[PDB]
Amino acid sequence: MNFGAFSINPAMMAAAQAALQSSWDMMGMLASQQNQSGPSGNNQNQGNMQ
């Protein structure tokens, strides 16, 4: 039957999602993992003339 959250959906659902947060702020390693520049690259080059 069409009688419930017609067009307007209950805020309790969204509020409950914001309750979990899943927040990154500084522990968010994912923000640095997008920088694929070889963070563990063993650049043991002979000198620096490159």
PDB file of C-alpha atoms in Angstrom:
ATOM      1  CA  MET A   1       0.000   0.000   0.000  1.00  0.00           C
ATOM      2  CA  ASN A   2       1.176   3.526  -0.793  1.00  0.00           C
ATOM      3  CA  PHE A   3       1.072   5.031   2.689  1.00  0.00           C
ATOM      4  CA  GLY A   4       4.263   5.878   4.497  1.00  0.00           C
ATOM      5  CA  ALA A   5       7.281   7.958   3.588  1.00  0.00           C
ATOM      6  CA  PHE A   6       5.576   9.513   0.571  1.00  0.00           C
ATOM      7  CA  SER A   7       8.162  11.801  -1.062  1.00  0.00           C
ATOM      8  CA  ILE A   8       9.401  12.922   2.362  1.00  0.00           C
ATOM      9  CA  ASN A   9      11.624  10.294   3.966  1.00  0.00           C
ATOM     10  CA  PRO A  10      12.023  10.141   7.779  1.00  0.00           C
ATOM     11  CA  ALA A  11      14.982  12.057   9.194  1.00  0.00           C
ATOM     12  CA  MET A  12      15.499   9.405  11.873  1.00  0.00           C
ATOM     13  CA  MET A  13      17.118   7.183   9.238  1.00  0.00           C
ATOM     14  CA  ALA A  14      19.597   9.843   8.144  1.00  0.00           C
ATOM     15  CA  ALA A  15      20.238  10.938  11.727  1.00  0.00           C
ATOM     16  CA  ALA A  16      21.006   7.320  12.615  1.00  0.00           C
ATOM     17  CA  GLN A  17      23.533   7.217   9.774  1.00  0.00           C
ATOM     18  CA  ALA A  18      25.174  10.398  11.000  1.00  0.00           C
ATOM     19  CA  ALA A  19      25.223   8.761  14.416  1.00  0.00           C
ATOM     20  CA  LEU A  20      27.709   6.149  13.191  1.00  0.00           C
ATOM     21  CA  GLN A  21      29.760   8.976  11.658  1.00  0.00           C
ATOM     22  CA  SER A  22      32.476   6.863  10.029  1.00  0.00           C
ATOM     23  CA  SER A  23      34.606   9.982  10.297  1.00  0.00           C
ATOM     24  CA  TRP A  24      38.184  10.370   9.200  1.00  0.00           C
ATOM     25  CA  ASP A  25      40.114  13.503  10.104  1.00  0.00           C
ATOM     26  CA  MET A  26      43.795  12.676  10.407  1.00  0.00           C
ATOM     27  CA  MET A  27      43.749   8.893  10.752  1.00  0.00           C
ATOM     28  CA  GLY A  28      42.307   8.945   7.249  1.00  0.00           C
ATOM     29  CA  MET A  29      45.188   7.127   5.567  1.00  0.00           C
ATOM     30  CA  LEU A  30      42.997   6.770   2.467  1.00  0.00           C
ATOM     31  CA  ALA A  31      43.651  10.445   1.709  1.00  0.00           C
ATOM     32  CA  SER A  32      47.350   9.659   1.342  1.00  0.00           C
ATOM     33  CA  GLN A  33      46.915   6.289  -0.390  1.00  0.00           C
ATOM     34  CA  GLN A  34      45.534   8.122  -3.423  1.00  0.00           C
ATOM     35  CA  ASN A  35      49.005   9.597  -3.864  1.00  0.00           C
ATOM     36  CA  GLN A  36      50.679   6.721  -5.697  1.00  0.00           C
ATOM     37  CA  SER A  37      54.188   8.122  -5.999  1.00  0.00           C
ATOM     38  CA  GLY A  38      55.980   5.152  -4.455  1.00  0.00           C
ATOM     39  CA  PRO A  39      56.066   6.105  -0.730  1.00  0.00           C
ATOM     40  CA  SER A  40      58.201   3.044  -0.023  1.00  0.00           C
ATOM     41  CA  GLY A  41      60.363   3.430  -3.100  1.00  0.00           C
ATOM     42  CA  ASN A  42      63.972   2.437  -2.474  1.00  0.00           C
ATOM     43  CA  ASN A  43      65.511   5.252  -4.509  1.00  0.00           C
ATOM     44  CA  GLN A  44      69.101   4.338  -3.715  1.00  0.00           C
ATOM     45  CA  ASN A  45      70.380   6.193  -6.764  1.00  0.00           C
ATOM     46  CA  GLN A  46      74.074   6.906  -7.186  1.00  0.00           C
ATOM     47  CA  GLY A  47      74.267  10.536  -6.180  1.00  0.00           C
ATOM     48  CA  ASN A  48      71.575  12.972  -7.277  1.00  0.00           C
ATOM     49  CA  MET A  49      72.406  13.706 -10.913  1.00  0.00           C
ATOM     50  CA  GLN A  50      69.116  12.755 -12.507  1.00  0.00           C
TER      51      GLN A  50
END
